[PDB]
Design an enzyme around this catalytic site. Sequence first.
Site, PDB file in Angstrom:
ATOM      1  N   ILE A 157      28.735 -59.756  31.077  1.00 61.53           N
ATOM      2  CA  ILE A 157      26.826 -59.999  30.998  1.00 61.53           C
ATOM      3  C   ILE A 157      27.133 -61.224  29.806  1.00 61.53           C
ATOM      4  O   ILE A 157      26.625 -62.278  30.434  1.00 61.53           O
ATOM      5  CB  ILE A 157      26.307 -59.149  30.513  1.00 61.53           C
ATOM      6  N   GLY A 158      27.568 -60.994  28.925  1.00 61.61           N
ATOM      7  CA  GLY A 158      27.582 -62.455  28.530  1.00 61.61           C
ATOM      8  C   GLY A 158      28.880 -61.938  27.316  1.00 61.61           C
ATOM      9  O   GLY A 158      29.408 -61.173  26.489  1.00 61.61           O
ATOM     10  N   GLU A 159      28.830 -62.745  25.968  1.00 65.77           N
ATOM     11  CA  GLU A 159      29.527 -62.909  24.663  1.00 65.77           C
ATOM     12  C   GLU A 159      29.237 -63.618  23.528  1.00 65.77           C
ATOM     13  O   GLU A 159      28.564 -64.358  23.980  1.00 65.77           O
ATOM     14  CB  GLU A 159      31.197 -63.232  25.714  1.00 65.77           C
ATOM     15  N   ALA A 197      30.681 -64.619  19.180  1.00 61.54           N
ATOM     16  CA  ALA A 197      31.966 -65.112  18.019  1.00 61.54           C
ATOM     17  C   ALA A 197      33.031 -64.562  18.325  1.00 61.54           C
ATOM     18  O   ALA A 197      34.134 -64.613  18.409  1.00 61.54           O
ATOM     19  CB  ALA A 197      31.775 -65.849  16.923  1.00 61.54           C
ATOM     20  N   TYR A 198      32.805 -63.411  17.925  1.00 59.99           N
ATOM     21  CA  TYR A 198      33.747 -61.728  18.015  1.00 59.99           C
ATOM     22  C   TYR A 198      33.456 -60.656  18.500  1.00 59.99           C
ATOM     23  O   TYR A 198      34.229 -59.786  18.404  1.00 59.99           O
ATOM     24  CB  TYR A 198      33.866 -61.696  16.921  1.00 59.99           C
ATOM     25  N   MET A 222      32.727 -59.310  23.471  1.00 57.41           N
ATOM     26  CA  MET A 222      32.493 -59.688  24.528  1.00 57.41           C
ATOM     27  C   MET A 222      31.545 -58.393  25.312  1.00 57.41           C
ATOM     28  O   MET A 222      31.163 -57.065  25.088  1.00 57.41           O
ATOM     29  CB  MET A 222      33.238 -59.466  25.419  1.00 57.41           C
ATOM     30  N   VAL A 223      29.959 -58.437  25.671  1.00 57.57           N
ATOM     31  CA  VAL A 223      28.732 -57.826  26.481  1.00 57.57           C
ATOM     32  C   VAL A 223      29.386 -57.543  27.954  1.00 57.57           C
ATOM     33  O   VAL A 223      29.788 -58.141  28.724  1.00 57.57           O
ATOM     34  CB  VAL A 223      27.851 -58.040  26.207  1.00 57.57           C
ATOM     35  N   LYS A 267      29.721 -52.923  24.724  1.00 48.83           N
ATOM     36  CA  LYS A 267      30.145 -54.196  23.590  1.00 48.83           C
ATOM     37  C   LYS A 267      30.958 -53.986  22.859  1.00 48.83           C
ATOM     38  O   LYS A 267      31.146 -52.857  22.170  1.00 48.83           O
ATOM     39  CB  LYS A 267      28.576 -54.778  22.434  1.00 48.83           C
ATOM     40  N   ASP A 297      16.177 -60.233  10.965  1.00 54.18           N
ATOM     41  CA  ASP A 297      16.722 -61.072  11.686  1.00 54.18           C
ATOM     42  C   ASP A 297      16.305 -60.852  13.276  1.00 54.18           C
ATOM     43  O   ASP A 297      16.774 -61.115  14.447  1.00 54.18           O
ATOM     44  CB  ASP A 297      18.250 -61.399  12.620  1.00 54.18           C
TER      45      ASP A 297
HETATM   46  C1  LIG Z   1      27.590 -60.896  21.429  1.00 56.35           C
HETATM   47  C2  LIG Z   1      27.278 -62.020  22.194  1.00 56.35           C
HETATM   48  C3  LIG Z   1      25.677 -62.232  22.257  1.00 56.35           C
HETATM   49  N1  LIG Z   1      25.337 -61.410  23.523  1.00 56.35           N
HETATM   50  C4  LIG Z   1      24.856 -60.764  24.274  1.00 56.35           C
HETATM   51  O1  LIG Z   1      25.086 -59.946  23.608  1.00 56.35           O
HETATM   52  C5  LIG Z   1      24.966 -60.793  26.159  1.00 56.35           C
HETATM   53  O2  LIG Z   1      25.005 -59.290  26.500  1.00 56.35           O
HETATM   54  C6  LIG Z   1      22.935 -58.714  26.358  1.00 56.35           C
HETATM   55  N2  LIG Z   1      22.452 -57.763  25.501  1.00 56.35           N
HETATM   56  C7  LIG Z   1      23.362 -56.701  24.860  1.00 56.35           C
HETATM   57  N3  LIG Z   1      23.263 -55.659  24.719  1.00 56.35           N
HETATM   58  C8  LIG Z   1      22.722 -55.215  26.402  1.00 56.35           C
HETATM   59  C9  LIG Z   1      22.510 -53.902  26.663  1.00 56.35           C
HETATM   60  N4  LIG Z   1      22.305 -53.013  26.324  1.00 56.35           N
HETATM   61  N5  LIG Z   1      21.708 -54.310  27.609  1.00 56.35           N
HETATM   62  C10 LIG Z   1      22.249 -55.369  28.970  1.00 56.35           C
HETATM   63  N6  LIG Z   1      22.577 -56.376  28.259  1.00 56.35           N
HETATM   64  C11 LIG Z   1      22.905 -56.355  26.776  1.00 56.35           C
HETATM   65  C12 LIG Z   1      22.695 -60.666  25.186  1.00 56.35           C
HETATM   66  O3  LIG Z   1      21.353 -59.908  26.262  1.00 56.35           O
HETATM   67  C13 LIG Z   1      23.911 -61.093  25.853  1.00 56.35           C
HETATM   68  O4  LIG Z   1      23.248 -61.495  27.193  1.00 56.35           O
END
Ligand SMILES: C#CCNC(=O)[C@H]1O[C@@H](n2cnc3c(N)ncnc32)[C@H](O)[C@@H]1O
EC number: 2.7.11.24
Length: 346
Positions: free
Chosen positions: A21-23, A25-26, A28-29, A44, A139
């Site tokens: 999904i994404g990442e 600084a420390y 990854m999701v 996460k 925040d």
């Molecule tokens: C570390 C860091 C920054 N990156 C993110 O957190 C990546 O995942 C997201 N996401 C966080 N919880 C999520 C969740 N429960 N269900 C679906 N997407 C989620 C944020 O929206 C990003 O798309």
Amino acid sequence: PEMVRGQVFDVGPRYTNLSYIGEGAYGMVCSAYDNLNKVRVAIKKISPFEHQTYCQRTLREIKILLRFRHENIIGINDIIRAPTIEQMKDVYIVQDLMETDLYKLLKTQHLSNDHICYFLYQILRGLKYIHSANVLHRDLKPSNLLLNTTCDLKICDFGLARVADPDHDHTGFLTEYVATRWYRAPEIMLNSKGYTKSIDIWSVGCILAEMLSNRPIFPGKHYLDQLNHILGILGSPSQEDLNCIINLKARNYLLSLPHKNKVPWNRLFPNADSKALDLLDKMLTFNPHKRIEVEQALAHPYLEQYYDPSDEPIAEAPFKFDMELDDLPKEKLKELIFEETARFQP
Ligand SMILES: C#CCNC(=O)[C@H]1O[C@@H](n2cnc3c(N)ncnc32)[C@H](O)[C@@H]1O
């Protein structure tokens, strides 16, 4: 162990078939399949232990989210880590899988007024519960608001969240501050440590504005620039609001500025609902003592189609930390993350 875009997710066997999904600084999701609940979830991966501040953020998130239970606040379903401190290099926070967050959404979608109204209601409903626990999020911003496929909204993160402390809020002019710049209330730059609930209301005000136009209303490019963005729209503070700023350096900075008029909300947002701008005005009030509170905001006419204080629950008790986490070493914080996560073992 499965590996995603370069690194290991030691989340098995319960969680399988990971997708990136994404990442940050420390961490990854990813999304993953929960073999027990037969649903895809978000996991996460957090790797905070090399740095005290990372360890602080991680511990505040885990400790608060485990205590909170509210429809508009993301829950923690599970936490995966190694059985011992020595073997724990990472922690995995499992959550309901959400479709997007408000940051990604505003990058790509125009919101109907109906969506704006419903999102704002949900933010404030969740914030009512948070503030009722004597907690400040500190925040709030679009990327800390998750949305599922039916537009249910859940406040997330809490890595900078604290217990409210209004008797210790005052500080000098240009005091260092950590939370995201564009969502900082004007008093942060003048005389406030951000230890009162009014700091969160300002951020919600900024979010409302950003929902109205898909653009951050106060995109300051550095510390003091943030204050001048706010003043460029709000205009010069009144004599009364200045007299509430007793610190001379802060007051004399404001006094040094040429007179600036208020930019009317309906010129910045000519397509917006007039009740939305009235509430916006009250959330983006310069004086934090005159700024609307969350329960007042829920009762505002803009939200009348949703407002139901009997369906807007509060916390069973105030939240408190064992000790202040501010000045604790990373090894000590790792210990607390270990203990705080023991209940999911295993
Ligand atoms: C570390 C860091 C920054 N990156 C993110 O957190 C990546 O995942 C997201 N996401 C966080 N919880 C999520 C969740 N429960 N269900 C679906 N997407 C989620 C944020 O929206 C990003 O798309």
